[PDB]
Design a binder for these strands. Structure first.
Ligand SMILES: [Mg+2]
Ligand SMILES: [Mg+2]
Ligand SMILES: [Mg+2]
Lengths: 80, 127, 154, 98, 205, 96
RNA sequence: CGAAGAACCUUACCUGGCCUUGACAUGCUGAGAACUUUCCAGAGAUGGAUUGGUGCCUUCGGGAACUCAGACACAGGUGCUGCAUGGCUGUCGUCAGCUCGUGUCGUGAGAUGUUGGGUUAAGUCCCGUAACGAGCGCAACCCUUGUCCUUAGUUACCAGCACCUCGGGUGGGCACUCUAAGGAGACUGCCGGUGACAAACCGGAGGAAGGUGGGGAUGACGUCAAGUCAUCAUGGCCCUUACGGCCAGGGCUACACACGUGCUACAAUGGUCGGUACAAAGGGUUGCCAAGCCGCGAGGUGGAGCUAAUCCCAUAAAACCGAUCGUAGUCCGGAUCGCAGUCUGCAACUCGACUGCGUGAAGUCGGAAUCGCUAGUAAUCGUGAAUCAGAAUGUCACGGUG
């Protein structure tokens, strides 16, 4: 998926909101509806409030999550 | 000299050229054994020759197009029948009794598309 | 049910020169695999030739006569009573029954080298100890038990 | 709907509007000799444009009826309007045959 | 049930209403123009009843032959409307447009013309049967060897979907050698929509 | 000279219109040559609801036709091209 | 099954953000040509800058085309009613029946025709008969497949002559094959028996085809108030500061369970390896995308030829020849899962298709029951296409063995 000819992917608004927010370190969560963007080594340890579908759920970014996308950590269906 | 005949069976058109000789038998510029590999085709093409016992008298040159192994073999049989008739027009009764000059009109029935085969339907569960 | 059914004739066995063997080969064939079935039929024939000095065609003919039955039951219900009628087998039908039973019991022999299954079935059929002959004799014994309904309530 | 026919017309208009800058950006990407630096900035141009410019967003509907499902591109009609327009001989060369 | 009587016979009996060839890149572009040309023309010429609108394409321009039983209404004072429509059809059909008008002498032998008159009559709150008994007879006095007319709809009822079935003469439908006209024009009453079918049968062969 | 059309009642009837009008002007033009005809079968479904056993398959033809001149010395056929083409005849010139 | 293609778009549903003459039609008032602005905020919608252009016919007054703002009538609704309907389809059923003009009988609803003998795929026909005729229906007419004649030979063919590098490869020829338009051909036509000798039935000659040669299209009056108001059209009711619209995500592909259809298997009539043979049909100048070339492979480069007997898609597979496997939950089976990639797409986590390595499950022919098929039929093996940026075990179309 997403062959190495066009390797990386990150949405422009998320990139500009995170790269700039790295300068003023983490004091707030990042609310973003995009789930298609991967996380990067430049975004290790941040707090992302990924959209579940009706509310935003927090995400604790770790160094071992770089390969996977944000949407894997947000549910779609409950099945309680 | 030489006689011409055309064969058609199961979408396989064949040209048959009867010539005097010693039965060299050439099909698409290769031998009969190299063409039909260990099947009934070798005799089924040769059957009209032995029916009228003239296998050794005629050299046969053949060109084939269309169809598969058995269809092309039936085409060569039909072509040899029609060519042999054109040469010695007195043995029509002998080949008619054998049913070789009768062209086989059985063509692949068109698929009743929606039925899985030309006639096979779904399983029809009634409830 | 108006009688419509005509006769379609298939007679071609050049490499051995017979007529019954082509019809038997048609019973061995599965999914139109005539080329595969032909070498298995001949594969089980050369083994019979190896086993017995006599020509395998005579062995096959003797096997057909030892499996082909004479009479068989016919379950026709009178409309209130389940009766069975032993009816004389037609001369044309009796060969097909033997050719169908032979392959059917050959498939379940359970040996290796599938042609060997049919070769063994044909060898046993010439003596009378084969499973096909036992099935023939079982139906024959059933026919005598059913002989009471030969013509009455039949 | 009619408002749905309306909103997919502007999709086609936007797709046909640019029609060349996206082709150039995708041609830059596809070249193996192109530099990754010239590819990364090209990613920005595709993404900052509105997404309703690709052929993927375009849904070719029936021209007279607007039914999305049951469409043939050799005609411009739906599955059921094509029969009505064809049985009356409007479509040239179209008959009932076997 | 009762497949369309024109589609079964295109060739030996009938022919298409538009003869023109286009490649795969212009077939759908010409069909869309030709289909909405008829909708505009029929909506404009509600009066001066139109039966057939043939569209032919000679080399690269156009050709149209509108059929009207009253050509004088369309051709008013030496084509005041002919040129006016020729100017406007170019806007909907960019290629230049030719317009030709012919007569439909014996106008009571065309399915479209009969259906339009029936639809007009049934919208005047005319009896649903007296109109048809006279419409069939007037068309049978001259010309056709057989006519069927079906009138299905509300027919003035509360919850009723009855279908009138008056026939006269011989009207085969499984005979492809025959030449049969057909039309379907609807009528919008103050309540209900009434559909009218016509099967004017002309001579065979 | 090679022609393309879709019906034998225009292309094969316009061959005489060219042959007579070209042989009248002195230049010798041999008889026309037919070529094999294209045959494209378009198969589509006919049932509105899914009853797929119903079928309808069409056919479109494209008749080809080739001429052959002997001595090119007449421009009359070049001038009389609009006359030769009537409704659907496309002519590609190969003046042999 | 509507679905001939659910990542967004389709899309109606849900959670939010944002609109109120509105995304769209007409009529009124004012302002600017249209256009292009390559920038910033914001999830986007949207809001604000925005180099620049000042058009076009001019009674030189202005008009027309487009865009912005105001308000009215309004527009819009995949909101209800398919028992209010049109149109279209399923259905008994491609079953052979269903009706009408006149006359007659019966007080009447009716019935006669349409019943009786024979025969037929058939209410198809013959003989009788208060019935005489006609219509719908059946057959034929239409399409496809199988024989022959005439017209004419390029991109098709090579009988005769040269040539050759021995490939019709080349000149050349118009004999033929081959191609495809126009027509003949099959009507129990003829012979023997059978029948009331009359339909018709059983055999025979000829003929390519013999008894409606095969298949397809073509389904009568009607039934189920069968399905569709969501394809479209429409009577009535309702929403019209939202049941109408625009933008983001998510959802329709959830999951102890039961059901229908379909593909794989469980193997030795078989599994792999290496040779070798023959198809039909179709799609391609907004496209097919060759050769060489680099990659274990999906593929990347490359750009030919091409608008089609020319070039490509495009290698058909089963079969046949030689080796091994020796029936073992296995050189069967491929599900599952881990790692690594290519292609399409702004975007492959929910949620795509394939390729490389490893893992190796259930499955040893399957209860009551139950289905399709009478001949190129069932069985089995391929090829290409419609929808389509991508996506098929379903489905579109034709062929091998049989
Ligand atoms: Mg019966
Ligand atoms: Mg009756
Ligand atoms: Mg696709």
């Amino acid at each position: 998926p997403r062959s190495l000819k066009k390797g990386p992917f990150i949405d422009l608004h998320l990139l500009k909101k995170v790269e700039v927010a790295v300068e003023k370190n983490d004091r707030k969560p990042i609310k973003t509806w995009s789930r298609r963007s991967m996380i990067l080594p430049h975004m290790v340890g941040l707090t992302i409030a990924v959209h579940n579908g009706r509310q935003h759920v927090p995400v604790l970014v770790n160094e071992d999550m770089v390969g996977h996308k944000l949407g894997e950590f947000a549910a779609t269906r409950t099945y309680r | 000299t030489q006689n011409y005949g055309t064969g058609r069976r199961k979408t396989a058109t064949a040209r048959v050229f009867l010539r005097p000789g010693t039965g060299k038998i050439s099909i698409n510029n290769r031998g009969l054994d190299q063409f039909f590999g260990r099947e009934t085709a070798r005799m089924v093409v040769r059957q009209p020759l032995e029916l009228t016992e003239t296998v050794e008298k005629f050299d046969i040159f053949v060109t084939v197009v269309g169809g598969g192994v058995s269809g092309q073999a039936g085409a060569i049989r039909h072509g040899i029948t029609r060519a042999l008739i054109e040469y010695d027009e007195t043995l029509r009764s002998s080949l008619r009794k054998a049913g070789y000059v009768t062209r086989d009109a059985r063509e692949v029935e068109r698929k009743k598309v929606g039925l899985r085969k030309a006639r096979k339907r779904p399983q029809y569960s009634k409830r | 049910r108006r009688r419509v059914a005509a006769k379609r004739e298939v007679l071609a066995d050049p490499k051995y020169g017979s007529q019954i063997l082509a019809k038997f080969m048609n019973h061995v064939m599965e999914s139109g695999k005539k080329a595969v079935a032909e070498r298995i039929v001949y594969g089980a024939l050369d083994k019979v030739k190896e086993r017995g000095k006599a020509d395998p065609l005579e062995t096959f003919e003797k096997a057909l006569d030892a499996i082909a039955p004479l009479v068989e039951v016919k379950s026709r219900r009178v409309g209130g009573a389940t009766y069975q009628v032993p009816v004389e087998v037609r001369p044309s039908r009796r060969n097909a029954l033997a050719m169908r039973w032979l392959v059917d019991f050959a498939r379940k022999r359970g040996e290796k080298s599938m042609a060997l299954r049919l070769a063994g079935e044909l060898l046993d059929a010439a003596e009378g100890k084969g499973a096909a002959v036992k099935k023939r004799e079982d139906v024959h014994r059933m026919a005598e038990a059913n002989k009471a309904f030969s013509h009455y309530r039949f | 709907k009619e408002s749905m026919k309306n909103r997919e017309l502007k999709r086609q208009l936007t797709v046909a509007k640019y029609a060349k800058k996206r082709a150039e950006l995708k041609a830059i990407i596809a070249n193996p000799n192109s530099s990754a630096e010239e590819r990364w900035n090209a990613q920005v141009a595709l993404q900052k444009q509105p997404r309703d410019a690709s052929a993927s967003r375009l849904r070719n509907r029936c021209r007279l009826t607007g039914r999305p499902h049951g469409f043939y591109r050799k005609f411009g009609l739906s599955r059921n309007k094509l029969r009505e327009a064809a049985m009356r001989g409007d479509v040239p060369g179209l008959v009932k045959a076997s | 049930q009762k497949v369309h009587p024109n589609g079964i016979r295109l060739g030996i009996v009938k022919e298409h209403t538009s003869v023109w060839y286009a490649d795969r890149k212009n077939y759908a572009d010409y069909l869309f123009a030709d289909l909405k040309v008829r909708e505009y023309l029929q909506d404009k010429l509600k009066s001066a009843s139109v039966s057939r609108i043939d569209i032919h394409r000679p080399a690269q321009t156009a050709r149209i032959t509108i059929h009207t039983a009253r050509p004088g209404i369309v051709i008013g004072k030496k084509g005041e409307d002919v040129e006016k429509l020729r100017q406007d059809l170019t806007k909907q059909m960019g290629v230049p447009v030719h317009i030709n008008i012919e007569e439909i002498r014996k106008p009571e032998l065309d399915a479209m013309l009969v259906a339009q008159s029936v639809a007009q009559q049934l919208e005047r709150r005319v009896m649903f049967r007296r109109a048809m008994k006279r419409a069939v007879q007037n068309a049978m006095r001259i010309g056709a060897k057989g006519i069927k007319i079906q009138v299905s709809g509300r027919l003035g009822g509360a919850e009723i979907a009855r279908t009138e079935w008056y026939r006269e003469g011989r009207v085969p439908l499984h005979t492809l050698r025959a030449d049969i006209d057909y039309a379907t024009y609807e009528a919008h009453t103050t309540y209900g929509v009434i559909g009218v079918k016509v099967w004017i049968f002309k001579g065979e062969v | 000279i090679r022609l393309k059309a879709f019906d034998h009642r225009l292309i094969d009837q316009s061959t005489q219109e060219i042959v007579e009008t070209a042989k009248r002007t002195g230049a010798q033009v041999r008889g026309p040559i037919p070529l094999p005809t294209r045959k494209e079968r378009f198969t589509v479904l006919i049932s509105p609801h899914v009853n797929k056993d119903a079928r309808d398959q069409y056919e479109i033809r494209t008749h080809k036709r080739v001429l052959d001149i002997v001595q090119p010395t007449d421009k009359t056929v070049d001038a009389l091209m609009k006359l030769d083409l009537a409704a659907g005849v496309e002519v590609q010139i190969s003046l042999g």
